[PDB]
Each structure stands twice: as structure tokens, then as C-alpha cells.
């Protein structure tokens, strides 16, 4: 027979061979979900939504040189690419606020803040916004294994002047490139590996690949992946003015007939990565999924800083094979077109030899580049392409490419496998998954390619759900000025006819941290909450529903005090039995336990129905007060108020012994 | 004979299960050999 020792082993071998191939797939090919993204970009763009708007206009972020950075703009510009020490370009994208920092918020003294490279401060602000954008309380990440992978390089800050006398050494850890991530991990409390790589403008995708490796292996929970590039000296412009590599007008003309140089910009960009299974087990928000990645080197070429074709084709094929896909499951590819008269044809020909090769005919493959809108970021270009891809996937449209009025004649465009984006093309979801890919080719040799996809089918149509019951809105900030700032923000948020009051209350209560200065408004309707926040932002508290204060100790020891007799009034909790179920349940259980020993119901006396005694006789007053106090204590404990001691004045000691557990409800009724 | 049929399937499960687990060990716990080393150090040590 089966002996159930040979056929019972079969059921536990054929159900292990299946948690092995599947475990193998989890080990090597686990997709990584993207949770949230943050960015500081030139031209006043400090939010992804403004970035998307700027992308759909087909606008420009080209301005003049900064004036408040201490530069010498009258002894710098020269219309001749000779006379070294001078630059022949007068354009360029720059940040509007690069010298701003909130020192007291992060606990940094003014002098230490004045001794920082602005890249670190911008990274701190961007990381805080990135954490808050995911609907995650930033105080819940303390002690968790979260990695910080960054791409950042030194540009020269305070290194031309003599160092001031700071015995504590504030001028080394501020400008060092290895503290840009350690400082984030120290000020935020993360417990994971922190690495600051160098890949010569392909650093962001290298950090992303390392984060994917770490997440798949299992040594990290979340990853903060990004890059930063904020100038402090005009040296880059001067140096590249000597090689005549800069564009005359400062515009990057990607894949256009006339490209004659690149143009630089400043920016900080960060994204948050997590495993998809843990992302939808915890209930987070998924924007896109990274499927596979590939890295290689240009190798032996005709120059140290010269591109090659076969290396690009090989890295493209490695990126395709590592996830189990083929060339043709693609809608659009993000390219690295910097306006290089020499690199653009090479990259395009590499793209037509894999993707436009023998391709389906009823569309070409869409080719675009983001560098024609904002310019070269030189440290966060790949992650900028990642943000562009995520925005296109979320909003369902492919933005156009500028300066492609006709294409360069050095790319064989007649094949029909690759066509440039000369307009906005619909990218709505249908029968086929919508995938696309980003490509960053560094100058030191390391080339990379990443394949993004759309997020699985999901429902989020449950936010709109409101009741007529009161809602508490609680705001908190480190300073009073910030308190009114946040109050005004929330008040102007509650103006629009589609802002759910319950949703806003839940988001404030759950997805925001708690700080020293606090305020709260309990509102039954919508204009009442508006007016309460109006007063809070107005710098006063006179109304009835507004309660505000400040705390310095983050937790208390609660003691319950039960007073004696003499504080009753006809109609205690007349509605609370109808609006709160715990109160009614506790009163009702007390009522059954007291039923054998009296002929009247406690709720009957509380609700003033006819046929019940008044509250002038002691023998009815005392049990009613006992029931009211015990129900109120249980209602207090149902909200997360855990007592540590109980005290009773005259006859409240019975209820105190009840709540302490030293007695039961039974002998208490007796 | 129900031993013969249910045993021969359990020897083609002992094979595949070993192969899969051994590939798992290769994936996560492969030792890395060191081949050669070079150094320039102060004091004439090269």
C-alpha cells in the first residue's frame, strides 16, 4: 500500500520543490515598488506636480547667473572662448533658494548650519518631505533598517577662505561627501546601510541598483535613493568654457540638427523604494515597479571620455534578460540626450539596433529626453528620468520633446522602429501593460539602463466617506509661527467642495508627527473647522472649540480620580447612550447586574422617561452615579488612556476598586 | 504494487529538490576565493 510514510512524504516533497523554485524567483527577480518621490528643481519647482505641469507646457527653466552667491559677474563673462578664468556662457538653470535652511528644526546651531555644504541641508529637507509624502509618520522609522543611497560630489564650499576657530570641528563633516547620508541617518534615526557613491553622473542609477540588490537580499526594509548637485563656484562653467563643450545659448538640444553643447543645472532628487509584497501587505501606495537593472563599463575605447556602441547594446540586452522580457514590450524610452553632437547619433543607433530592429509596424517606439526641459543635472539625471516616467505613468500621457522640429541627419530615421516625440501622445491603460525605460551613460565609463512598468490593478475610491458626528482636527509644530503656518495651510485646504473632513482628520491624526506646540479644534460641520483654523492661524484662541498649548514631556502617568456624591444633574449622558456604544454597553451590563435588587432601569432614570423615579432620593442617586462613573472610565480607557492609579473621595472607592480589578462588577452592585 | 509507483516518484522528487536547494545555496552563500594581492605601503614596503 502507500504505508503513509512513503506517500505521506510525497505530499511534503512536492510542496517543498514548490517553495524552492518560487523562493529562487523571490531571491533573484523580485520587483521593487516605488512609494513616494521628492525633488528640488530650478525655476521655483519644489514639488512633483509643478514638474509635471512644466513638462506638459513644454516650457523652459533657463535663467541668468545668481547674484546673491557672492559671484563676480562683471569680471567673469567674456564673449571669447579664450582668456582663461572667464566663461563665454551667460545662461544656465539655477535654484531660487539655495542658501536657506531651518537650523532650529533639525537641532543644528546657526554656526554649524553656516558651515554646511547646502547640498546636505537641501537633502535633509527633501528627505523629510519624502518621508512625509508617503503617508508615514516620520517618528515610526526610528530603529528600523532603512537604507540611504546617494549620489553626491564636492563642488567647493568655504574652501577658498581661511577656516574659522571651531574647536569642535564643524568645517569637516559639513563639506565632506560621506556625511551627506550619515547626517540623514543620524537626524532621522534610520538603522540601515548608508552609501554615497561616485559614478560620474551615473551615480543615481548605480545607487538604485545597489538598493534593489539590498532589498532583494533582505538586509533592508526601505531605501531612500537619490542624488544632489548644487553649485557653489562657477568653476565648472569656466573649465568647460576652455574645451568649447558648452552650448552658445545654454540650451540642451537633444536629438536635434544643431546640437553644439550641453547646459548645466542644479537639483536634488530622492525616491523611496520598498518590496511590493511588503508594500501591499502594509497598505502603502504604489506608483510604479522597478523590474530589472543592468550595469557595465565602456571599456577600452578611443578615449577616456568617449562613448561606445557595443557597450550600450550589451547593457540594454542585460537589462532585458535579467527580468525575463524581450525587446518589444515597450511604449517609450527615456534617453540620455545632453545635446552632444557626437553622443546622440551613437545612442540613437544603439537604440535602433535592439528596439527598432525588426519591430512591429503599427507604431514606432517613442524616443524622448527630459534634458531639453530643465537641462543637465550631472548628479541626479537618472532619478529625474525616473520621476518623469512615474509622472507619465500616473497621469497617463507622454510629454513632448523640445528642439526636435526636424531630426539630426546622422540618425537613420527611415526604419520606422524609433520615432521622436514631437507632441503629447495619449498613454491610457488598455489590454497591454505600459512599460518604458530610462538610460544613463556616465562620463567615466559606467553605463546603466532601468525598465519601469505600471502599478497593478487597485481600487482607491474609498477616501470620500463622511458622517455627521464630530471630528477632531489636531495640528502640531515646533514653533508658534509654524503652528499658524500649518493652521493657515489646513484652513485653505478645507475651502474646496471636494475636501473630505473625515479624511483630513484621519490624515492629520495618523500620517503626521507630533511636535511641541499643539492645537486642536473639534468640529461638527465644515465651516466650523474653517473658522477654528482661521482663529488658530490668526494668533489667538477665544472661541469654544479651540484648545491649544505646549508640552515638553512626551508622555504622562494617568491617575483616575472618582469624586463623591453631590455632582449629579438630571439627564447625564442623555445622548451618549445613542452616540457611543461602549457607554451604553457598560451601563446596560451594570443594569442587568443591578436588576435583581431593584425594580427600575438605570437608563430609564438617565433618559427621564415617564414611570421612573427622580434624582432626589439617595438610594437611586448613588447607583446612577456609580454606573455613570464606571461607564465613563471604560470609555476613557477605550480611547487609549491606560491608568496607573485610582483614588476615591467618599463612595467612589467602590468604583475605584472596580476599575483597578481589586473587585468585580458583581460585589460592586451588592 | 503501490510501493513501487509511489516510491519511484519520490526518487525523482529527491533529485529535483536537492538540485533546487543546492542552487539556492549557490545563490546566497557562495564563498569567494582570494587570488592575489598587491600593496604600496610607507617605509619602502611595496
Amino acid at each position, epitope marked *: 500500500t502507500d504505508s503513509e510514510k512513503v506517500a505521506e512524504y510525497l*505530499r511534503r516533497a*512536492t510542496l517543498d520543490l514548490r517553495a524552492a*523554485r518560487q523562493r529562487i524567483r523571490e531571491l533573484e527577480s523580485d520587483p521593487i515598488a516605488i512609494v513616494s518621490m521628492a525633488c528640488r528643481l530650478p525655476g521655483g519647482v519644489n514639488t512633483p506636480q509643478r514638474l509635471w505641469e512644466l513638462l506638459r507646457e513644454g516650457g523652459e527653466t533657463l535663467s541668468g547667473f545668481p547674484t546673491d552667491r557672492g559671484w563676480d559677474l562683471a569680471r567673469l563673462h567674456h564673449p571669447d572662448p579664450d582668456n582663461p578664468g572667464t566663461s563665454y556662457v551667460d545662461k544656465g538653470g539655477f535654484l531660487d533658494d539655495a542658501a536657506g535652511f531651518d537650523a532650529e528644526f533639525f537641532g543644528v546651531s546657526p554656526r554649524e548650519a553656516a558651515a554646511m555644504d547646502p547640498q546636505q541641508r537641501l537633502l535633509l529637507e527633501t528627505s523629510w518631505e519624502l518621508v512625509e509624502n508617503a503617508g508615514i509618520d516620520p517618528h515610526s522609522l526610528r530603529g528600523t533598517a532603512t537604507g540611504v543611497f546617494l549620489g553626491v560630489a564636492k563642488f567647493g564650499y568655504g574652501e577658498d577662505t581661511a577656516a574659522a576657530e571651531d574647536v569642535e570641528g564643524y568645517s569637516v563633516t559639513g563639506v565632506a561627501p560621506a556625511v551627506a547620508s550619515g547626517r540623514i541617518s543620524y537626524t532621522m534615526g534610520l538603522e540601515g546601510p548608508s552609501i554615497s557613491v561616485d559614478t560620474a553622473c551615473s551615480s543615481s542609477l548605480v545607487a538604485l541598483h545597489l538598493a534593489v540588490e539590498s532589498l532583494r537580499k533582505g538586509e533592508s526594509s526601505m531605501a531612500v535613493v537619490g542624488g544632489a548637485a548644487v553649485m557653489a563656484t562657477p568653476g565648472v562653467f569656466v573649465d568647460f568654457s576652455r574645451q568649447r563643450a558648452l552650448a552658445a545659448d545654454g540650451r540642451s538640444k537633444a536629438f536635434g540638427a544643431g546640437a553644439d553643447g550641453f547646459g548645466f543645472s542644479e537639483g536634488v532628487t530622492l525616491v523611496l523604494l520598498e518590496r511590493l509584497s511588503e508594500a501591499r501587505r502594509n497598505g502603502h501606495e504604489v506608483l510604479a515597479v522597478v523590474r530589472g537593472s543592468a550595469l557595465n563599463q565602456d571599456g577600452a575605447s578611443n578615449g577616456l571620455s568617449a562613448p561606445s556602441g557595443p557597450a550600450q547594446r550589451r547593457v540594454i540586452r542585460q537589462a532585458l534578460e535579467s527580468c525575463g522580457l524581450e525587446p518589444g514590450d515597450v511604449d517609450a524610452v527615456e534617453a540620455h540626450g545632453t545635446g552632444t553632437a557626437l553622443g546622440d547619433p551613437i545612442e540613437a543607433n544603439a537604440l535602433l539596433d535592439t528596439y527598432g530592429r525588426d519591430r512591429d509596424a503599427d507604431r514606432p517606439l517613442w524616443l524622448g529626453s527630459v534634458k531639453s526641459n530643465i537641462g543637465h543635472t550631472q548628479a541626479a539625471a537618472g532619478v529625474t528620468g525616473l520621476l518623469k516616467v512615474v509622472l507619465a505613468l500616473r497621469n497617463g500621457e507622454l510629454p513632448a520633446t523640445l528642439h526636435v522640429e526636424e531630426p539630426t541627419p546622422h540618425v537613420d530615421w527611415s526604419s520606422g522602429g524609433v520615432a521622436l516625440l514631437a507632441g503629447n501622445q495619449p498613454w491610457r491603460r488598455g489590454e497591454r501593460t505600459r512599460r518604458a525605460r530610462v538610460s544613463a551613460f556616465g562620463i567615466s565609463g559606467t553605463n546603466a539602463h532601468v525598465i519601469v512598468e505600471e502599478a497593478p490593478e487597485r481600487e482607491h475610491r474609498e477616501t470620500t466617506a463622511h458622517d455627521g458626528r464630530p471630528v477632531p482636527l489636531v495640528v502640531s509644530a515646533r514653533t508658534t509661527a509654524a503652528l499658524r503656518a500649518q493652521a493657515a495651510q489646513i484652513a485653505e485646504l478645507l475651502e474646496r467642495p471636494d475636501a473630505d473632513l473625515a479624511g483630513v482628520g484621519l490624515g492629520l491624526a495618523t500620517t503626521r508627527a507630533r511636535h511641541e506646540h499643539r492645537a486642536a479644534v473639534v468640529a461638527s460641520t465644515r465651516e466650523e473647522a474653517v473658522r477654528g483654523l482661521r482663529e488658530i492661524a490668526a494668533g489667538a484662541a477665544t472661541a469654544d472649540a479651540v484648545v491649544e498649548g505646549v508640552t515638553e514631556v512626551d508622555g504622562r502617568n494617568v491617575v483616575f480620580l472618582f469624586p463623591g456624591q453631590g455632582s449629579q444633574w438630571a439627564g447625564m449622558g442623555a445622548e451618549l447612550l445613542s452616540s457611543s456604544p461602549v457607554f451604553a454597553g457598560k451601563i446596560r451590563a451594570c443594569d442587568e447586574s443591578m436588576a435583581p435588587m431593584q425594580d427600575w432601569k438605570v437608563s430609564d432614570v438617565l433618559r427621564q422617561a415617564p414611570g421612573a423615579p427622580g434624582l432626589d432620593r439617595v438610594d437611586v442617586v448613588q447607583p446612577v452615579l456609580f454606573a455613570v462613573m464606571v461607564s465613563l472610565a471604560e470609555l476613557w480607557r477605550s480611547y487609549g488612556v491606560e491608568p496607573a492609579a485610582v483614588v476615591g473621595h467618599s463612595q467612589g472607592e467602590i468604583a475605584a476598586a472596580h476599575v483597578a480589578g481589586a473587585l468585580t462588577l458583581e460585589d460592586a452592585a451588592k | 504494487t503501490d510501493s*513501487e*509507483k509511489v516510491a*519511484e516518484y519520490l526518487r525523482r522528487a529527491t533529485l529535483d529538490l536537492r*538540485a533546487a536547494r543546492q542552487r539556492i545555496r549557490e545563490l546566497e552563500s557562495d564563498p569567494i576565493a582570494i587570488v592575489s594581492m598587491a600593496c604600496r605601503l610607507p617605509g619602502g614596503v611595496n
Partner: antibody, heavy 118, light 114 residues
């Protein structure tokens, strides 16, 4: 994977004997049953017989058209499977495969092509 | 006695398509201890055959990932994901409810479609 090595092909006269030989390397031969599959042109695979491993007996089973004409033996000490054929007919010019396992034909050897010719 | 099994005799499929083979038996073919009493097989032209699928549920070790197998009752399917150059040959569907069997199967011949 493991290797089954097979030999014993050649020219035969219709009505005489011939013995094959199949050795196994990489696995224990004393635990597997062995089946024999003939392959001739104009037809597909055909099971012709199988022998049981030790600890389960030594019973052998054959096909209807070969019962009383062929025999299969084995030696687990020196670990070979032998197929001995008596009174061969001209329609059995074929290549013989030895298959590991009585029912799960998991492995197939390279085979030898032996022919009876008049 | 022996359950009859069959398969389409020939099906040339161009590379790049999710080809499929079926095995429509006459009576129910299932295994109590396992899942189904069925085993798929392959043989390229000119060499020894090989095992692909056992119980009609497992995927053999050493054969590519694109192969698979499903079905129950009297209907089964060998769902292949993609077709390549060395996919030509003959496929066989065998049952193991009672032995010795006699419905060995002519086999499906697969080649390049033109």
C-alpha cells in the same frame, strides 16, 4: 547528469542469439527498475519489457510479441543490465534504449543500433 | 481497461507564440496521493527522448522554464510560453493509472511553420 553506457550492436542472422550490455555511472543501479524500448523505422517508441530492482523481488515482465523469445537479466555487484535475444526475426533491426525506472521513463540512453540481416 | 489518450498529430508553430498541446483522455485520469495520473514527454529528432512533466503538474529539472502543464478530469494542456529553434521534435502524453499500458501514443510532431 548521470551516464548510461550501452553496447552490443552489430550484424545478426535470423534465428540466433545476441546480448546487449548497459552500465550505469553516477547513481546506484541496485535501486532502480530497468525498462527496454526498441526503436525501428516506420514506427514510434515501443516498450518491450522491464525488470524490477532488488529488495522488491526479481520479477520480470515482457510484451505479448516477445514473451518467450527475449529475456532480461542484471548484475548489481558489477551493475549491468543485459538483454538476451534468442531466435531473432528480420523485422527487429532496431536501436535499443535502456530506460531508468519501471513507469517513470526518466532517463534514456544513447542506444545501439543492432540489425539481423539475411 | 486502459484509458485511451490522444493528441493532435502535427502543429507547425512559428517562433514567438504561446503554443499549446492537449491530451483529451476518455475516462477521468487523476492521482489520490498526487494530482493527476499523467506524464508529458519530449524527443528531438535523432536522439534519446526526455521527460518534461510529471503528474502533469511538475516541471522537470533541466528543461527550460517556458514549459508547464495543467488540466484535470479528461482534458490537459501543455502550455508553452515561447517557441525557439531547437523546439522541433515529437511530444508524447502517457498515463499511469494502471500498468503495463498499451496506448503509448503516436506523438505530436512539431516543426517550423512556413
Amino acid at each position: 547528469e548521470v551516464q548510461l553506457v550501452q553496447s552490443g550492436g552489430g550484424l545478426v542472422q535470423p534465428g540466433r542469439s545476441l546480448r546487449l550490455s548497459c552500465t550505469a555511472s553516477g547513481f546506484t543501479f541496485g535501486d532502480y527498475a530497468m525498462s527496454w524500448v526498441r526503436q525501428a523505422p516506420g514506427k514510434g517508441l515501443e516498450w518491450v519489457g522491464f525488470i524490477r530492482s532488488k529488495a522488491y523481488g526479481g520479477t520480470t515482465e515482457y510484451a505479448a510479441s516477445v514473451k518467450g523469445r527475449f529475456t532480461i537479466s542484471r548484475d548489481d555487484s558489477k551493475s549491468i543490465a543485459y538483454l538476451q535475444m534468442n531466435s531473432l526475426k528480420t523485422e527487429d533491426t532496431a536501436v535499443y534504449y535502456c530506460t531508468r525506472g519501471g513507469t517513470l521513463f526518466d532517463y534514456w540512453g544513447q542506444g545501439t543500433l543492432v540489425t539481423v540481416s539475411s | 481497461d486502459v484509458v485511451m489518450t490522444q493528441s493532435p498529430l502535427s502543429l507547425p508553430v512559428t517562433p514567438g507564440e504561446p503554443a499549446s498541446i492537449s491530451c483529451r483522455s476518455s475516462q477521468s485520469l487523476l492521482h489520490s496521493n498526487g494530482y493527476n495520473y499523467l506524464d508529458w514527454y519530449l524527443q528531438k529528432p535523432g536522439q534519446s527522448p526526455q521527460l518534461l512533466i510529471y503528474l502533469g503538474s511538475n516541471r522537470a529539472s533541466g528543461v527550460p522554464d517556458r514549459f508547464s502543464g495543467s488540466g484535470s478530469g479528461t482534458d490537459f494542456t501543455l502550455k508553452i510560453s515561447r517557441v525557439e529553434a531547437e523546439d522541433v521534435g515529437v511530444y508524447y502524453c502517457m498515463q499511469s493509472l494502471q500498468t503495463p499500458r498499451l496506448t503509448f501514443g503516436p506523438g505530436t510532431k512539431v516543426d517550423i511553420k512556413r
